[PDB]
């Protein structure tokens, strides 16, 4: 009933089958399909997620108009997502004057001042990591990064948000550790063909987040809420905040606590895994980086907030990895008005998509796009890089509110880990890595590596 | 479109509201509503579960026609239940010539011969129970029965079916113990008003059993299948069985393994909890029973299969409890034909229901129906009891296939428990017990009791 939309505006794309759209083209994952499309169709193309049209753009100025310029006016919300139940009040899912109300009420939690106030705490679990690694290093036993990294990222989230202190790797059976550790699978494809069936599940209290984990943290939060009240973390600042322009409700407060936890668990863990792979497969880079760390932190000195930003080959290494594996893959915004941006009409209701993964591997802005070369981000060459071709944290008012915290969380782990250990591939280590043909930005085979002690 | 069905046949009942039916009358639970209806309307009445008519019968001969006589011809299947995914092949859910095919292929597992072959095994975990109770008995700390009883019933199921041996109470964090321990809640009411929405969830692979626990046991079973093949329990006999009239498939085999596990976990545990309450609130009965046990098993002798059936005050105690709390509450069968049984027309499609709980408390067949008096089942008075008024295990071809195993499982626990401990109520012990106004036959407040050692 709408599969003729791009044929009308003269916008190219693959031919959508009825009802399915082009979702059968996802057999190789969003990334390979975007790379193919960006290659076949050029600067702008179109396709249909079921009955839903999606438009892809690759011009730095047009992306800037959508993410930055016309964010408030036109492109304010991401693609609708459901069923969710009470999770409607979550920021990344919120919309319009209820997003602007929440993005404000929670921005003060990622300031340089508060972020520096978390340096003594995040550092405490970088140490706990070393013991868990050294126990498996002295017992030569190849190591799965995501396991031990997940336990660390888990340990940092909990502390930085609620104060609950657990050695999740050695307490994988703690009642607070279990609950926590929990788009092309059989369900979500049925959602994109049956978006008319989402409202059924919403009057059903059925949620893609199980109704159990949430109810454990609706109460675990209100336990801690009444445990510090009255008697430095994310929640101590979210309680200080409810003390535009209505204050923060309490089921509203329980919702954002959850979104941070995923945000910083599988992403802090996944990215650190993509990094230790690149170091293990480019040991020269691992050499140059351990030299820089011990030059800023001699005698294995403890990283501080001001020493972390001081490490430049560290930032270069982090950036280049994110180019190769930008965990979001795509950036998306929903167009709320008949608007003509940068000389092109965008009708109301169209999802606007930026293919981040494909753009990070576009040879027109990247020489040797699939090799690992941190030298792209040296202060020498870091200036020929369009800020709208490279967006691992998005851009504009709706970008990643936790970016500063993520770059600080990961670099405090890399300093403390690379001060002590070094990483060599295994025989059973997948060289080279194959990306998941599925729906998340993750490896086909989990990253296994040999670990030795300095 | 069908709410005029009972008005037509001249059958009385509460007035159904559009779409909801009489389900708003479930605010006091199925039990209180059936008692009320049986009291207001007499021997036969009618009501609507949404758009679905249900007919209640209370005559011994008419129940016998449905459960026993015309089971094969007319009343073969229970009320349709979904969504379920692959669990369609489960016996209690199976229908017609695929139930008759499965009820046969699995009946040989509850014979007196095989049941006696499980006596040495089930006895091993009655002992493990004592230590866990004595640890909390020597530390005077009131005891929650369902916790420790659940761990025991759990320990017996696993062993009697797969051989996996765990102290689930002290291993509540065993990867095999966790998966296992998992009708008027917000969901199932939406199902009975929206039965047209079930087929949506079936093409969605959404199942009221989470798609996770099942996939752990589709593989855990096929681990054990290829671990004994090649190298006494339920599965060793289900593999021996696939060695009417097609053999047992392997996803067919994974399904029945699950249905036994619930069947014998929350029911073996719940019933033993309703029993220890009745003993604690009628200590004279507890006195008479410990005398009988030590008279059959002197010196705290180990129960055997032939000593267990020998205990008559034990059976009396078990029976009378089940009268007071018959965990099924109702028996149901779906009518597949225009039939006129015992002088009454039953049109096609009508669910036929027997109110077991209400009938167990009907003063016309029970003197002092709400008191606890095991003497109703003494060999003296046990003959004035209609086998179709008292059906804790159902009746006829479709009755509880595991009845013999349940009466043997529980009595082996009561002998070993009452040989050693005695049970007194607490202050915080709920005297008298309030039944759950909800959907399962369970207490409002979990049973807590003081435990002392002989
Ligand atoms: C390697 C680490 C991370 C990366 C690469 C990353 C990337 C992104 C990206 C690309 C977006 C979408 C931005 C857009 O649409 O323009 C986003 C959104 C978001 N991120 Fe992250 N993220 C990371 C870690 C975190 C962490 C640790 C948090 C902790 C709270 C967090 C919280 C959020 C939130 C709340 C949003 C939604 C913002 C909004 O809609 O206003 N992220 N992130
Ligand atoms: C206190 C213990 C138990 C009680 C009171 C009980 C009661 C019942 C009742 C009333 C029914 C329905 C019968 C009917 O519709 O006429 C039933 C069915 C069933 N029970 Fe139990 N049960 C118990 C324990 C068990 C156990 C331990 C198992 C182990 C496998 C089991 C397996 C089954 C099965 C498979 C069915 C369905 C039979 C069929 O549809 O063919 N039950 N039970
Ligand atoms: C794809 C379509 C168009 C159908 O729907 C969307 O696009 N929905 C996206 C994600 S759905 C739900 C998600 C939270 C969640 C998902 C699964 C298990 C547990 C929690 C969310 O609510 N928020 C995600 C925030 C966590 C995060 C991830 C990466 C970086 N930083 C933070 C929304 C999204 C937000 C941010 C980046 C990328 C996507
Ligand atoms: C009420 C309407 C009319 C809508 O649906 C039905 O009546 N569905 C009944 C039960 S639903 C699913 C159930 C299994 C199950 C349920 C919940 C969590 C885990 C597993 C089953 O599949 N089987 C139950 C067998 C276990 C058992 C319980 C008690 C005694 N022995 C064995 C089916 C039923 C079977 C047997 C007795 C009472 C009810």
From Swiss-Prot, chains A, B:
Induction: By drugs, such as rifampicin.
GO molecular function: 1,8-cineole 2-exo-monooxygenase activity; 1-alpha,25-dihydroxyvitamin D3 23-hydroxylase activity; anandamide 11,12 epoxidase activity; anandamide 14,15 epoxidase activity; anandamide 8,9 epoxidase activity; caffeine oxidase activity; enzyme binding; estrogen 16-alpha-hydroxylase activity
Top-level taxon in the UniProt lineage: Eukaryota
Pathway in which the depicted protein is active: Steroid hormone biosynthesis; Cofactor metabolism; retinol metabolism; Steroid metabolism; cholesterol metabolism; Lipid metabolism; fatty acid metabolism
Residues where heme binds: 400
Subunit-structure text: Interacts with PGRMC1; the interaction requires PGRMC1 homodimerization.
Listed name of the protein: Cytochrome P450 3A4
Provenance organism: Homo sapiens (Human)
